[PDB]
């Protein structure tokens, strides 16, 4: 959950087109968190 966070955080402002919801929910969502 740290690094998909960093990760998470950093691209939101990359790109307008893709919506990622807050991301400890969308880690969980891919599961990736776990």
Not at 1 to 28: D, E, F, N, S
């Amino acid at each position: 959950c740290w690094l998909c966070r960093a990760l998470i955080k950093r691209i939101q402002a990359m790109i307008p087109k893709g919506g990622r919801m807050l991301p400890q929910l969308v880690c969980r969502l891919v599961l990736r968190c776990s």
